[PDB]
C-alpha cells in the first residue's frame, strides 16, 4: 500500500508543452458551454443543464454553486472534479480568511486560492490536473463586481464577459458584439440568455437552463432581522419561473 | 494496446484484472481441497502429495484453526494461505476483545474478504495465490465459505478448489441431490474422504496422504478438531473401498 | 506514453481510459436492477442468478442494508461491491455520531461519489468497477434514489435502471412517465409499487421470473428492508392474476 | 514471455508463476551441498564447505540458533545470517517470556511467514538461500527443509545444493536403516557422511573441507570442524 | 443520583430519579438518566455527566455500526463495549454504568460496570450516591421472576427511599420497560411516591 | 510497482544537461517578453501581455508585474500560476528577514533564496521544475539599484539591461546597441518600449497589451518609490515616446 | 510572578467628533527599578493604530508580528487594512496561543478610510474583544484610567478638546500607579492628519 | 452575566443582560452576549468570554460548511453535538458554558452545554452568575403553552431579576425570538432601564491646560 | 549576580564586566572575560545561569560570523541586537530557557555612531546611553543619571565607569574581583589592560 507515486505525473516535453495540462484543456473543450457577463450593477453566470436521462432530476445537480454569500461559480469540463473543487473552495474561504479576519474574502483572493489548488495538481506527486475551467463571479466592498476564469494550469484572468466549453469561440464572438460598459443587470441577463440559445440544441427553458446572479443584497434570504449592517447575500439563483418570464421577451 | 497484465490494479479494456486471473492459475495448479456442510457442522479435507518417502507422515499439517471454532484449508501458494490465516486470527482476536462473543462465520468471512480484496487495489502488492475454504459453527448454525483471489466469496453447501476441483464438484453435486434433508457429520467425514480419493485421479502419479477436520455442534461441541486415529482409518477404508 | 491507459492520467483526447474500463467491469455480473419511487416508499429490484448448485442461495445478494433508513443495490463484481458497502456503512454510522442525525440518502451518495472522484485523480488508487444505487424515504425529501458511478458522478432520479439491458428498462420507464405525467408511482401500498416494478421489469426484459430469480428491497419512513423468497412469491402471484 | 513477468516479486506470470522467487531458488542449486537426517534420538547436519582459492578458507555452512536448535545453509550466505539471526531471537523470546524452548515446528512456521512477506510486496526481494533445520524439543528429534518460497517441510532426511539429488536418493533408500540408529551418534554421522559423499564429483571430503553438526536427547547442538571430523573421513 | 435495573419474568426494567446537582444547587430537576444505546439495550448513568454522555454516545455509535454488519447485538456485547471504554480509560473517567437489555433468546439481563471498569452480570443492580441507603431494603425485598407490576413496585419503593435520604437524588422517578412486547416509558411524580 | 510511470525529472542527459530544465526554458521562450533596464536614478520593468481580448478586464489584471517588497519587484515570464507560488514564498522570506533584523532584506539575499528553491526541484524530490523566469528590480542601501534574473535551473545573474521570454535574442541585441551607463530613467522607459515595439509578434503595440513599472528615488522625498503604471498611464507614455 | 506587572505601563483610547485618540506612558521597568523612559507602546500599520501594555518582550514581539501580517495583507489585497478588520486579526492571532498566551492588553484605534467612522477596541490576553464606543483602557493603572475616563469623558469632543481630555485622564491615572508614568505620548487622529505630542509629567 | 432560554408554543426565545466585567470593574456597559451560530440558531455564553466567542464562531463556521455540503438547513442537534464533542476533548480547559436555542426543519429546540462537555434539554434554562435570580423567576411564572408574547415577558423578567439582584449582571436586556415558520428576530437592547443620569458638571478642560513638550505630524501615507 | 555595565559616549561604547566566577563557597577564577566579539565592530557581554551564559554567547557569535562570510558584509549593531532579541524571545517559551542577560555595544560604521543595547533573558530590548544587568543598576543608574553627558570623550567615559566601579566596591556584598573594560569604536574593539588602577 502507501502512495508510492511521489513524483510528478505532469512534466515538460521537448517542445516545452505540459501534456497533462493541454489534455485537461481538451476535456474542458468537450464540456457543455457556460458563460458570464459583468454589468454595472451585477454579474450573471449561466450554463445548460445537460440532463443525462429524462428520468434524472436535473435540479438535484447544480452546475452553479454559491461559494460565499457574495460569490458564485460555474464550470465546463468534468462535473465530478468541479464538485470537489467547490467543497474545497468553500472550505478555504473559511480556513484561510473568515476564521482570521471575521469576514468573507474578496473575489480575487478566493479565486487566487482556488487557482493555487489547481496549480498544485499540476506539480504535486501522483496526481493529474483538474479537468475543468471555472467562471467565478462575485462582489466585495472595495473592488465592486468582478468575473474571473480559472484554467487547469492554475492561471486566472478577469473578464468583462466570456464563455468556455463546447461553443466558446462562437459565444465569445457574439458577446463582443453586444457588450458595453453601460449594461444594467437585466440587460446582461438578456444577453446571457441569447448567447446560451445558440449553444443549446434541444429544449431551451427554465428547466434546462441554470442561471445565477451577483446583484443587490437580498435581506429576505438572510434568515434573521435585528442587525442593520447585515443586509443579506448578493448571490442568487434564478428560479425556473423567473427564467421563463424572461424567455418570452427573448 | 497491451501490457494491461503487467501491473496488479489495472483494468484491461474489457474490465478485467489480469493479475488476479493469473493468481487463479497458481490456485488451479495446486492440490485439491474441499469442504462439506452437514446438518450441524462442517467438514474439511485436503489432498497432501507425498513427494518422497522422506516426508514424515502426519507431520506437515495443512488445515488450520482460527479462534477455537473455525477451520481453514486452501489450495495454491501455501505461504499465502498461512499469511491469510494469520490475518484471520488477528481479525478474530480483535472482534472477541471488543464484543466478547467469538466471531460469527459470516462476519469472519467478510473480514478475510475485505483484506483479500484490498490486495487487488494497488500495484504495490500482489494478489493472494490461494482459494480458501473455511467455516464453523456459531450462534445460528453451521456455515461453509470459499474465497477466491479476487476477494470474491459466497456461502456453500459444498465446495472444492485445486487440481481435481471438477471431480469434487461433480461428487458434491450428487450428494446435494441425494440428500435434501441434510448429511450427518459422521457421514460427511466419510463422504469427504471418498471425494478426495476420487479427485486424486487428476494427480494419480504421486502417492498422497489424507487429512480431515470437522466442527459439529453434536460431535465436537462446536469446536474445530482434527479427525484422527480410528475415525480417520474408518473413513480411509470407506474410500479405498468405493475407489474399486 | 502508452501508460496513459494504465493509470488515471489524461490521454491526448482528455479521456481517462481506466475510468471507462471500470465502467465496463460493472456489467461483468450480467445482472439488471431498477428503482422506482412510490407515494411514500422506494423500491429496488434486481435479477438474482445462482448458476452453481453448490452455492447457498441465501448468501448471494447485491442489495445491502447500509443504515436503518438507507438501502444500496450494486451493479458490478461482488468484492468491489462489498468494499463500497462496508465503507458506506461506516460513513453513515460516523455521520450520525458527529452530526446528531441520520445521514440522508443524497448526502451518503455525494460522499461516496467524492471518494470515487479521488480514485479518478490519484494514481495509486484504482476506481471500483461498480455503480451504486442508494434509496430511502428521506425525512426532508421523501422517497429518494441517488446513483453513483466510477467517474465520481451522481444525481437523483424519479426512477432508474442499471446493467447490460439498462437501456430497454430506461425507455420502458420513460414511456410510462410521459404517459402518467407524474414523477412517481401513484400507489399507497409498497406492495403494489413492488408489483409495478416487477411488471415493467418483465415487459422490458421479455422474461418471466420465479421467486428465486429476483431480489427486492423496500424503503419506508424510518426503515429499509429486503423481501424473502416467499414475500416475493406472494408478489408474483398477484401480478399473475392480472395478466 | 518470462522477461516481461520477472521484473519483481509482485508480478504473476500468465501461468501463475513467480519468477523472482524461482530465480532465488536457483541460487540455492548453485550453492554447495549439505545433508540432514535424523533418528528418534539425534538429528544430524553434514555440509561440504566451499573455498574460493587454495589460499582462502572454506566458508562455514552451519549456524547454531540455541542449545537445542541449528541449521545449515545453501545459497546466499548473508541471507542465511539474517534468517538464522531472526531465529536466534525467536528462540530467545520463547525462553525469556515463557521459559519455554521453542518447538522446531514453530520455528519452521516463523521462518515460512518471514520469507512470505518478501514475495508479495514491492521493493523487496526473496531470500536467496535454502536452510536445513535440526533440533531436539519436547517431541523428539526433528529435521526441517526451508525454501525461499516460504515452503517449510519436516523430513526424516534430505539434501540441498548442487548435485544434492545424489544424497537425497541414497537417503530415500537408507531410510529404514538410519531412522533406527538410536543412542549411537557416531553411527548417524557416518550414515550422513556416506549420504553426502553420494553428491561428490570434484574432490573428496577432507579435514578442512567437512563440517558436521549434531543435536539430541542429551546432546546440545554442537559443531564439529577440522581435526574434530577427521575420525569420519 | 439513584439508579437501578431489575430483571423479571418478561424482561427487565430500568429506573432512576431525575436530579442533577452542582454542589447544593439543583441544575436540572427533570433530568433523563435512562439512556438508549440500542432499540432494546439501555443504560443508567452515574458519575461525571460529561463522561457518561461521551461514553454512551460512543457506545451507541459502535452498536449502530455493529448492527449494520452483523445484526442485533447481545446485551453482553453492549456491556463489553462499555467496559472496554471504561477500563482502558480508567485514569480519566469517573463513570458508573448499569447496562440492561432484552434479548429474545436470553430474555432480560443486567450488567453493572462500576468505577474501575470491571463487569458484573447480576439479577438486579443499584448504583449512584443514593444506592447506599437501599442496600438492605433491596436485598430483603427482591425476588427472581417477579411480574411487571411487582417489579415496577419494587423499583418505585426502592427509589423513593433512596430519594428520601439522599439529597443528591430527587424529582420524578423514570422507568423503562424492556420486553418482547416493546419499549414502555413510565414516569412517577413526588405526590405519589413520597407517600409510600 | 510505481517505478514504471516515473519520468525521472531530475537526471542528467549523456551530455550533462538537465532535461526538464531545458524543456522548461523552451516553454519560457514562448511567453510574453519582459524587459528590465537599470539607470542611474532608477529602474524600469516592462512586459508584453501574451494573448488578449476585447472583454479582458485590464484594470483589474496583473499577469507579469508583481510587488515583492516596497523596494523589490519582479517581472514574470512563463507559467503564471507557478510564478504566484514562488512570489508568495518570496514575500514571506522578505517579512521573515525584516522581523529578524529590523531591516529590509538586501535584494541579492532574497534573489538567492528564490533561486535556491528552484535549484532544489532540480536535484531531489522527483517533481517537475517551475516553468518560470524572473527579472528582479530592487533597491537597497548597499548596492543601490539592482537588476537580476533567475530561471528554472536556479541560476541567477545581475544586469544593466535584460529580457526574458520570447525573442530575447533580438531584444538583447537591440538593448546592447542603445544602452549607455549614464542613462536616466526616462531614457530607459523609452528604450524599453522601443525594444518591445520591435520584437512584438503582434500587429502594433497598444496600451492594453502592456504592463509597466518603475522604481525611482523621487528626489523630493529621499525614499524609494515603486510605481506600477495604470492603463491610462501606459497609454500616455506610449504617445509621448512616439508610438501613439 | 505576574507577567503583567513586571514592566509596568498603560494605554488609553478615546473617540471624538470625526477623530480618535490613543495615548500611552513611556516607562519600562523591572519591578521597582525604572530602566527606560523612552519605551513607547503605540504602533501603527497604515492608518491603523495599536497600543500594547503588559510584558515588554511580548509587546515587541506582537508589534513585529502585526507589522509582518499587515505587510502581507497589503501586498495581497492591494489596500491598507481597516480598523475593524485588524481588530479581528488581533483577536484570532491571540486566541491561537490560547494555552501559551502573550501577556498583553492590546488596544486598537483608527478611522475607517471609507466610512469615515471613528473606531476603537480592546482585548484581554487571549483575544476577547471589548468594542466600546467611548474609551478603552489597559495596563497596570487600568482601575485609575476607568475612573478618570468615566468622569472626564463626554461624547463628540473636537480634536483639540479630546486632546485635553485624554491627556488629563492618562496623566492623573499614571500618578496614582507606581509602575506607570515617566513620560507620555498622545496621538490625535483625523481622516487626513495625525499629530503626535509628548506630554510633560512628574518624573518619579 | 444572566442568560435565559424559554420555549413557547411555536418556538423558543433567549435573552441576556449586557454587562461585561473584569473582576469587580465594568469594562463594557452594553456588550452583546447573543451570538449567532447560524441564521436561526442563536447562542449565549458565560464563563471565559474569549472561549464562548471562539467556540461559537468555530462551530458556526463548520455548521455553515456542513449546511452547504448537505444542501440542508442547519440543525440545532448538530451544533450541540459539535460543541459538546469539542469541549469534551479539551477536558474543561475551554471555559465555555452556553445556552443554545433555535429552530430547524424538525422543530424548536433548547439546550444548555457545560465546559466539560455535558448537555441538557429543557423548557426553561438559565446560566451565569445571575443564574439563580433568573431561575427563581422562571420557577414562579413559567407554564406550558406560553404565547410568543408571554415568553418574551417571562424571559425579559428573568434577566431583570439578574440585573437588579446579581452584581455580576446589569444594564440592558437583549432578546432573540425564533419562531417555527419565520425568520429569527434579534431585539438588541429590547429594554434599557439603566440610563446614567446627567452629570452635575462638565469636565471639558480649557484648551492649553495640558503641558506639551514636543509636537509633530505623523506620516500615514506610503 | 555578576557585574555587567555599559555606557555610550560621543564616539564609542564602553563595556565593563566583573572577573570573578564563584561556585558556592569558592571563587574559582578571578580573570574571567564575560564577553564575545560578534563582529569587528560589535561586542556582547553577558551574565546569568552557569552553563547557559557561554553556550548562548558562543552560539550567537557562530551565527554572526556565518552571516559575515556568506554576505561578505558586517550587520549593523541594530540588526545584530534584533537577531539576539528574537533568539532570547524564542527561548523564554521553550522547554528549557537560556537564563542569560546581555549588553551589546557596537559602532555603526554607516551612521558613524556608537550604540548600546540592553536585553534581558525574556527578550526585553531597549537602547540606552548607559545600562546594567542585575543588582548593579541599583547603584549605578543614579550615579550616571547624575554625571552623564552625551558629548563625553572616551576618556571622560572611562572616568565615569571608574566612579561606578568604586561605588560597587563600596556598597555591594560580593567581591566581584574588579572588571575588564573594552572599548568599541570606529576602529574596532580594544581592551584597556590598565584599569586595576587607572
Per-domain boundaries in chain D: 1-233
Spatial CB neighbours of D30, under 8 Å, sequence gap ≥ 6: D75, D162
* Residues of A engaging C, defined by a Cβ cutoff of 8 Å: 3-5, 9, 19-20, 23-30, 52-57, 59-61, 79-81, 83-84, 87, 121, 126-131
Looking up cell 475551554, which residue turns up?
Answer: H94
Question: What's the CATH number where F136 sits?
Answer: 3.60.20.10
Tell me the C-alpha to C-alpha distance, in Å, between residue C50 and each of C54, C61, H15: 9, 10, 66
Rounded CA-CA distance C134/E96 in Å is 41
Spatial CB neighbours of E177, under 8 Å, sequence gap ≥ 6: E11, E12, E13, E148, E152, E183, E184, E186
Rounded CA-CA distance D115/D113 in Å is 5
Picking from C53, C206, C19, C33, the residue whose alpha carbon sits closest to that of residue C125 is C19
Q: Mind telling me how many Å the CA of F1 is from chain D's nearest CA?
A: 6
Structure resolution, Å: 2.4
Q: Mind telling me how many Å the CA of D227 is from chain B's nearest CA?
A: 32
Question: What's the CATH number where G147 sits?
Answer: 3.60.20.10
Catalytic residues of E: 1
Contacts of D153 in chain B (CB under 8 A): 55, 60
Domain map (residue ranges) of chain A: 1-250
Distance of CA G149 to the CA centre of its chain: 14
Q: Do E65 and C93 touch (CB under 8 A)?
A: yes
In order of their start, the domains of chain I are 1-198 (3.60.20.10)
Residue of H nearest to C95 (CA): H78
Rounded CA-CA distance D126/D124 in Å is 7
Rounded CA-CA distance C203/C199 in Å is 6
Let me know: does F164 contact F156? Beta carbons within 8 Å. no
Let me know: does F5 contact D14? Beta carbons within 8 Å. no
Q: Mind telling me how many Å the CA of E51 is from chain H's nearest CA?
A: 8
Q: Do B26 and D17 touch (CB under 8 A)?
A: yes
Domain map (residue ranges) of chain B: 1-244
Amino acid at each position: 500500500m502507501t502512495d508510492r507515486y511521489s513524483f510528478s505525473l505532469t512534466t515538460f516535453s521537448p517542445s516545452g508543452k505540459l501534456g497533462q495540462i493541454d489534455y485537461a484543456l481538451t476535456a474542458v473543450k468537450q464540456g457543455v458551454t457556460s458563460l458570464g457577463i459583468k454589468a454595472t450593477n451585477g454579474v450573471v453566470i449561466a450554463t445548460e443543464k445537460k440532463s443525462s436521462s429524462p428520468l434524472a432530476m436535473s435540479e438535484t445537480l447544480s452546475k452553479v454553486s454559491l461559494l460565499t454569500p457574495d460569490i458564485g461559480a460555474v464550470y465546463s469540463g468534468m462535473g465530478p472534479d468541479y464538485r470537489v473543487l467547490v467543497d474545497k473552495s468553500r472550505k478555504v474561504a473559511h480556513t484561510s480568511y473568515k476564521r482570521i479576519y471575521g469576514e468573507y474574502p474578496p473575489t480575487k483572493l478566493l479565486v487566487s486560492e482556488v487557482a493555487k489548488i489547481m496549480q498544485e495538481a499540476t506539480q504535486s506527486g501522483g496526481v493529474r490536473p483538474f479537468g475543468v475551467s471555472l467562471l467565478i463571479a462575485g462582489h466585495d466592498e472595495f473592488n465592486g463586481f468582478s468575473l474571473y476564469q480559472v484554467d487547469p494550469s492554475g492561471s486566472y484572468f478577469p473578464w468583462k464577459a466570456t464563455a468556455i466549453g463546447k461553443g466558446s469561440v462562437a459565444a465569445k464572438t457574439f458577446l463582443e458584439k453586444r457588450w458595453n460598459d453601460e449594461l444594467e443587470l437585466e440587460d446582461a441577463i438578456h444577453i446571457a440568455l441569447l448567447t446560451l440559445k445558440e449553444s443549446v440544441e434541444g429544449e431551451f427553458n427554465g428547466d434546462t437552463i441554470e442561471l445565477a446572479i451577483i446583484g443587490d443584497e437580498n435581506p429576505d434570504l438572510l434568515g434573521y432581522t435585528g442587525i442593520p449592517t447585515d443586509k443579506g447575500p448578493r448571490f442568487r439563483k434564478l428560479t425556473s419561473q423567473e427564467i421563463n418570464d424572461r424567455l418570452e421577451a427573448l | 494496446g497491451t501490457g494491461y497484465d503487467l501491473s496488479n490494479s489495472v483494468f484491461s479494456p474489457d474490465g478485467r484484472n489480469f493479475q488476479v486471473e493469473y493468481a487463479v492459475k497458481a490456485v488451479e495448479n495446486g492440490t485439491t481441497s474441499i469442504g462439506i456442510k452437514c446438518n450441524d457442522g462442517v467438514v474439511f479435507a485436503v489432498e497432501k502429495l507425498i513427494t518422497s518417502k522422506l516426508l514424515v507422515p502426519q507431520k506437515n499439517v495443512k488445515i488450520q484453526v482460527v479462534d477455537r471454532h473455525i477451520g481453514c484449508v486452501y489450495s495454491g501458494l501455501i505461504p499465502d494461505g498461512r499469511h491469510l490465516v494469520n490475518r484471520g486470527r488477528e481479525e478474530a482476536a480483535s472482534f472477541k476483545k471488543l464484543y466478547k462473543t467469538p466471531i460469527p462465520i459470516p462476519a469472519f468471512a467478510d473480514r478475510l474478504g475485505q483484506y483479500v480484496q484490498a490486495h487487488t487495489l494497488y500495484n504495490s502488492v500482489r494478489p493472494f495465490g490461494v482459494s480458501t475454504i473455511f467455516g464453523g459453527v456459531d450462534k445460528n448454525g453451521a456455515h461453509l465459505y470459499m474465497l477466491e483471489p479476487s476477494g470474491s466469496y459466497w456461502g456453500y453447501k459444498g465446495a472444492a478448489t485445486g487440481k481435481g476441483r471438477q471431480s469434487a464438484k461433480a461428487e458434491l453435486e450428487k450428494l446435494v441431490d441425494h440428500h435434501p434433508e441434510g448429511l450427518s457429520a459422521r457421514e460427511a467425514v466419510k463422504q469427504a474422504a471418498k471425494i478426495i480419493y476420487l479427485a486424486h485421479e487428476d494427480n494419480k502419479e504421486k502417492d498422497f496422504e489424507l487429512e480431515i477436520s470437522w466442527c459439529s455442534l453434536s460431535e465436537t461441541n462446536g469446536l474445530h478438531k482434527f479427525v484422527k486415529g480410528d475415525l480417520l482409518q474408518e473413513a480411509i477404508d470407506f474410500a479405498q473401498k468405493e475407489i474399486n | 506514453a502508452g501508460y496513459d491507459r494504465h493509470i488515471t492520467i489524461f490521454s491526448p483526447e482528455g479521456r481517462l481510459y481506466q475510468v471507462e474500463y471500470a465502467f465496463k467491469a460493472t456489467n461483468q455480473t450480467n445482472i439488471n436492477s431498477l428503482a422506482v419511487r412510490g407515494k411514500d416508499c422506494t423500491v429496488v429490484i434486481s435479477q438474482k442468478k445462482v448458476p452453481d448448485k453448490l452455492l447457498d442461495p441465501t448468501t448471494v445478494s447485491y442489495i445491502f442494508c447500509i443504515s436503518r433508513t438507507i438501502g444500496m443495490v450494486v451493479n458490478g463484481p461482488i468484492p468491489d461491491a462489498r468494499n463500497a458497502a462496508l465503507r458506506a456503512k461506516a460513513e453513515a454510522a460516523e455521520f450520525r455520531y458527529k452530526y446528531g442525525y441520520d445521514m440522508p440518502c443524497d448526502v451518503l451518495a455525494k460522499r461516496m461519489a467524492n471518494l470515487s472522484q479521488i480514485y479518478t485523480q490519484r494514481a495509486y488508487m484504482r476506481p471500483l468497477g461498480v455503480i451504486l444505487t442508494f434509496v430511502s424515504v428521506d425525512e426532508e425529501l421523501g422517497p429518494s434514489i441517488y446513483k453513483t458511478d466510477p467517474a465520481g458522478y451522481y444525481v437523483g432520479y424519479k426512477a432508474t435502471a442499471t446493467g447490460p439491458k439498462q437501456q430497454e428498462i430506461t425507455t420502458n420507464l420513460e414511456n410510462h412517465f410521459k404517459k402518467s405525467k407524474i414523477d412517481h408511482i401513484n400507489e399507497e401500498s409498497w406492495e403494489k409499487v413492488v408489483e409495478f416494478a416487477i411488471t415493467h421489469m418483465i415487459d422490458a426484459l421479455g422474461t418471466e421470473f420465479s421467486k428465486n430469480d429476483l431480489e427486492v428491497g423496500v424503503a419506508t419512513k424510518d426503515k429499509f428492508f429486503t423481501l424473502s423468497a416467499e414475500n416475493i412469491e406472494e408478489r408474483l402471484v398477484a401480478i399473475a392474476e392480472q395478466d | 514471455f518470462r522477461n516481461n513477468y520477472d521484473g519483481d516479486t509482485v508480478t504473476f506470470s500468465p501461468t501463475g508463476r513467480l519468477f523472482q522467487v524461482e530465480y532465488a531458488l536457483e541460487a540455492i542449486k548453485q550453492g554447495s551441498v549439505t545433508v540432514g537426517l535424523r533418528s528418534n534420538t539425534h538429528a544430524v547436519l553434514v555440509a561440504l564447505k566451499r573455498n574460493a582459492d587454495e589460499l582462502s578458507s572454506y566458508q562455514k555452512k552451519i549456524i547454531k540458533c540455541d542449545e537445542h536448535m541449528g541449521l545449515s545453509l545453501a545459497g546466499l550466505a548473508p541471507d542465511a545470517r539474517v534468517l538464522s539471526n531472526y531465529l536466534r531471537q525467536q528462540c530467545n523470546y520463547s525462553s525469556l517470556v515463557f521459559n519455554r524452548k521453542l518447538a522446531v515446528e514453530r520455528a519452521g512456521h516463523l521462518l515460512c511467514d518471514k520469507a512470505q512477506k518478501n514475495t508479495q510486496s514491492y521493493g523487496g526481494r526473496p531470500y536467496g538461500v535454502g536452510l536445513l533445520i535440526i533440533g531436539y524439543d519436547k517431541s523428539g528429534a526433528h529435521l526441517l527443509e526451508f525454501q525461499p518460497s516460504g515452503n517449510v517441510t519436516e523430513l526424516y532426511g534430505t539434501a540441498i545444493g548442487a548435485r544434492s539429488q545424489g544424497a537425497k536418493t541414497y537417503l530415500e533408500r537408507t531410510l529404514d536403516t538410519f531412522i533406527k540408529i538410536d543412542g549411537n551418534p557416531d553411527e548417524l554421522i557416518k550414515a550422513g557422511v556416506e549420504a553426502i559423499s553420494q553428491s561428490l564429483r570434484d574432490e573428496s571430503l577432507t579435514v578442512d573441507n567437512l563440517s558436521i553438526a549434531i543435536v539430541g536427547k542429551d546432546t546440545p547442538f554442537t559443531i564439529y570442524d577440522g581435526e574434530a571430523v577427521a575420525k569420519y573421513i | 443520583t439513584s439508579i437501578m435495573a431489575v430483571t423479571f419474568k418478561d424482561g427487565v426494567i430500568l429506573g432512576a430519579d431525575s436530579r442533577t446537582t452542582t454542589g447544593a444547587y439543583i441544575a436540572n430537576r427533570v433530568t433523563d438518566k435512562l439512556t438508549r444505546v440500542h432499540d432494546k439495550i439501555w443504560c443508567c448513568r452515574s458519575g461525571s455527566a460529561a463522561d457518561t454522555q461521551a461514553i454512551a454516545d460512543i457506545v451507541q455509535y459502535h452498536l449502530e455500526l455493529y448492527t449494520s454488519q452483523y445484526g442485533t447485538p447481545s446485551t453482553e456485547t453492549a456491556a463489553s463495549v462499555f467496559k472496554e471504554l471504561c477500563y482502558e480509560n480508567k485514569d480519566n473517567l469517573t463513570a458508573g454504568i448499569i447496562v440492561a437489555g432484552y434479548d429474545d433468546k436470553n430474555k432480560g439481563e443486567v450488567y453493572t460496570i462500576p468505577l474501575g471498569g470491571s463487569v458484573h452480570k447480576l439479577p438486579y443492580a443499584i448504583a449512584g450516591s443514593g444506592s447506599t441507603f437501599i442496600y438492605g431494603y433491596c436485598d430483603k425485598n427482591f425476588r427472581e421472576n417477579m411480574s411487571k407490576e411487582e417489579t415496577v413496585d419494587f423499583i418505585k419503593h426502592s427509589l423513593s427511599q433512596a430519594i428520601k435520604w439522599d439529597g443528591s437524588s430527587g424529582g420524578v422517578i423514570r422507568m423503562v420497560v424492556l420486553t418482547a412486547a416493546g419499549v414502555e416509558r413510565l414516569i412517577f411524580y413526588p405526590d405519589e411516591y413520597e407517600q409510600l | 510497482g510505481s517505478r514504471r510511470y516515473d519520468s525521472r525529472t531530475t537526471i542528467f542527459s549523456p551530455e550533462g544537461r538537465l532535461y526538464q530544465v531545458e524543456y522548461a526554458l523552451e516553454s519560457i521562450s514562448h511567453a510574453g517578453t519582459a524587459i528590465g533596464i537599470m539607470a542611474s536614478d532608477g529602474i524600469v520593468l516592462a512586459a508584453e501581455r501574451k494573448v488578449t481580448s476585447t472583454l479582458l478586464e485590464q484594470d483589474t489584471s496583473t499577469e507579469k508585474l508583481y510587488k515583492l517588497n516596497d523596494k523589490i519587484a519582479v517581472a514574470v515570464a512563463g507559467l503564471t500560476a507557478d510564478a504566484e507560488i514562488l512570489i508568495n514564498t518570496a514575500r514571506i522570506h522578505a517579512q521573515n528577514y525584516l522581523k529578524t533584523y529590523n531591516e529590509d532584506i538586501p535584494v541579492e539575499i532574497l534573489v538567492r533564496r528564490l533561486s535556491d528553491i528552484k535549484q532544489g526541484y532540480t536535484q531531489h524530490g522527483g517533481l517537475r521544475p517551475f516553468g518560470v523566469s524572473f527579472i528582479y528590480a530592487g533597491y537597497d542601501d548597499r548596492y543601490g539599484y539592482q537588476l537580476y534574473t533567475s530561471n528554472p535551473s536556479g541560476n541567477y545573474t545581475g544586469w544593466k539591461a535584460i529580457s526574458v521570454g520570447a525573442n530575447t535574442s533580438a531584444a538583447q541585441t537591440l538593448l546592447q546597441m542603445d544602452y549607455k551607463d549614464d542613462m536616466k530613467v526616462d531614457d530607459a522607459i523609452e528604450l524599453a518600449l522601443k525594444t518591445l515595439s520591435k520584437t512584438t509578434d503582434s500587429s502594433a503595440l497598444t496600451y492594453d497589451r502592456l504592463e509597466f513599472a518603475t522604481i525611482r528615488k523621487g528626489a523630493n522625498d529621499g525614499e524609494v518609490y515603486q510605481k506600477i503604471f495604470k492603463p491610462q498611464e501606459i497609454k500616455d507614455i506610449l504617445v509621448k515616446t512616439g508610438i501613439t | 510572578s505576574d507577567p503583567s506587572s513586571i514592566n509596568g505601563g498603560i494605554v488609553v483610547a478615546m473617540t471624538g467628533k470625526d477623530c480618535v485618540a490613543i495615548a500611552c506612558d513611556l516607562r519600562l521597568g523591572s519591578q521597582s527599578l525604572g530602566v527606560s523612559n523612552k519605551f513607547e507602546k503605540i504602533f501603527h500599520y497604515g492608518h491603523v493604530f495599536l497600543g500594547i501594555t503588559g510584558l515588554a518582550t511580548d509587546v515587541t514581539t506582537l508589534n513585529e508580528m502585526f507589522r509582518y501580517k499587515t505587510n502581507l495583507y497589503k501586498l495581497k489585497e492591494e489596500r491598507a487594512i481597516e480598523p475593524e478588520t485588524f481588530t479581528q486579526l488581533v483577536s484570532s492571532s491571540l486566541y491561537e496561543r490560547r494555552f501559551g498566551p502573550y501577556f498583553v492588553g492590546p488596544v486598537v484605534a483608527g478611522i475607517n478610510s471609507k466610512s469615515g467612522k471613528p473606531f476603537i477596541a480592546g482585548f484581554d490576553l487571549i483575544g476577547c474583544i471589548d468594542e466600546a464606543k467611548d474609551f478603552i483602557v489597559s495596563g497596570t493603572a487600568s482601575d485609575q484610567l476607568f475612573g478618570m475616563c468615566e468622569s472626564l469623558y463626554e461624547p463628540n469632543l473636537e480634536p483639540e478638546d479630546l486632546f485635553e481630555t485624554i491627556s488629563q485622564a492618562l496623566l492623573n491615572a499614571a500618578d496614582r500607579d507606581a509602575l506607570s508614568g515617566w513620560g507620555a505620548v498622545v496621538y490625535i487622529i483625523k481622516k487626513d492628519e495625525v499629530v503626535k505630542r509628548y506630554l510633560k509629567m512628574r518624573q518619579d | 452575566t444572566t442568560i435565559v432560554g424559554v420555549k413557547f408554543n411555536n418556538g423558543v426565545v433567549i435573552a441576556a443582560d449586557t454587562r461585561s466585567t473584569q473582576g469587580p470593574i465594568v469594562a463594557d456597559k452594553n456588550c452583546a452576549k447573543l451570538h449567532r451560530i447560524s441564521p436561526k440558531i442563536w447562542c449565549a455564553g458565560a464563563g471565559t468570554a474569549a472561549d464562548t466567542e471562539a467556540v461559537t464562531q468555530l462551530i458556526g463556521s463548520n455548521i455553515e460548511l456542513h449546511s452547504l455540503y448537505t444542501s440542508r438547513e442547519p440543525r440545532v442537534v448538530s451544533a450541540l453535538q459539535m460543541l459538546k464533542q469539542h469541549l469534551f476533548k479539551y477536558q474543561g480547559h475551554i471555559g465555555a458554558y452556553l445556552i443554545v436555542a433555535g429552530v430547524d426543519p424538525t422543530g424548536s429546540h433548547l439546550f444548555s452545554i457545560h465546559a466539560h462537555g455535558s448537555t441538557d434539554v429543557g423548557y426553561y434554562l438559565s446560566l451565569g452568575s445571575g443564574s439563580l435570580a433568573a431561575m427563581a423567576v422562571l420557577e414562579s411564572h413559567w407554564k406550558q403553552d406560553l404565547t410568543k408574547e408571554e415568553a418574551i415577558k417571562l424571559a425579559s423578567d428573568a434577566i431583570q431579576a439578574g440585573i437588579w439582584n446579581d452584581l455580576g449582571s446589569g444594564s440592558n436586556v437583549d432578546v432573540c425570538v425564533m419562531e417555527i415558520g419565520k425568520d429569527a428576530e434579534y431585539l438588541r437592547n429590547y429594554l434599557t432601564p439603566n440610563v446614567r443620569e446627567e452629570k452635575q458638571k462638565s469636565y471639558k478642560f480649557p484648551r492649553g491646560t495640558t503641558a506639551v513638550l514636543k509636537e509633530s505630524i505623523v506620516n500615514i501615507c506610503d | 549576580m555578576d557585574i555587567i555595565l555599559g555606557i555610550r559616549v560621543q564616539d564609542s561604547v564602553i563595556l565593563a564586566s566583573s572577573k570573578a566566577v564563584t561556585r558556592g563557597i569558592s571563587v574559582l577564577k578571578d580573570s574571567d572575560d564575560k564577553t564575545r566579539q560578534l563582529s569587528p565592530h560589535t561586542l556582547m557581554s553577558f551574565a546569568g545561569e552557569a552553563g547557559d551564559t557561554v553556550q548562548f554567547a558562543e552560539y550567537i557569535q557562530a551565527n554572526i560570523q556565518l552571516y559575515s562570510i556568506r554576505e561578505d558584509y558586517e550587520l549593523s549593531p541594530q540588526a545584530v541586537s534584533s537577531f539576539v532579541r528574537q533568539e532570547l524571545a524564542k527561548s523564554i517559551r521553550s522547554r528549557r530557557p537560556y537564563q542569560v542577560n546581555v549588553l551589546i555595544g557596537g559602532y555603526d560604521k554607516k551612521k558613524n555612531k556608537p550604540e548600546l543595547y540592553q536585553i534581558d533573558y525574556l527578550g526585553t530590548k531597549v537602547e540606552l546611553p548607559y545600562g546594567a544587568h542585575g543588582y548593579s543598576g541599583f547603584y549605578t543608574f543614579s550615579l550616571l543619571d547624575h554625571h552623564y553627558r552625551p558629548d563625553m570623550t572616551t576618556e571622560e567615559g572611562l572616568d565615569l565607569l571608574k566612579l561606578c566601579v568604586q561605588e560597587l566596591e563600596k556598597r555591594m556584598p560580593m567581591d566581584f574581583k574588579g572588571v575588564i573594560v573594552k572599548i568599541v569604536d570606529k576602529d574596532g574593539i580594544r581592551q584597556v589592560d590598565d584599569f586595576q588602577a587607572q
